[PDB]
Write a protein that binds this DNA or RNA. Structure first.
Length: 67
RNA sequence: UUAAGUUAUUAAGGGCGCACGGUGGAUGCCUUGGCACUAGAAGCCGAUGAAGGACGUUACUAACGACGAUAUGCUUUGGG
């Protein structure tokens, strides 16, 4: 997904982080009430959030060198 | 039959020999860990926050290892 992410503009990435965090919140609420049954999604969403943050930090590092 | 005489039999328990069990962890065989050295690098980090820690992180989580709210891991260049 790292190559797909690099196509997004910097404002799309923020919106995507904001949606993945909400999606992860809902899964943790479902797990606690005992009705989830698909526990493999929690790790997937966490890894996507980590990738988005990595690509976002890359651009901010890179532009400061050019500036 | 009566006298006189001699010598037998018991094992409550014990002793010795033998057979068969239990307890215990010596002996033999073994090695995951150690000990003494040789050759070649190197030796000491820190206010750009150290050495050493505390708390946390896995779907289910007590301890040790790994990691730090990007947490039982993220990106990239090579190998396979």
């Amino acid at each position: 997904k790292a190559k797909e992410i690099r196509d997004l503009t910097t404002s799309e990435i923020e919106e995507q982080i904001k949606s993945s965090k909400e999606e992860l919140f809902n899964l943790r609420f479902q797990l606690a009430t005992g009705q989830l049954e698909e526990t493999a999604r929690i790790r997937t969403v966490r890894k996507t959030i980590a990738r988005l943050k990595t690509v976002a930090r890359e651009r901010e590092i890179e532009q400061s060198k050019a500036n």
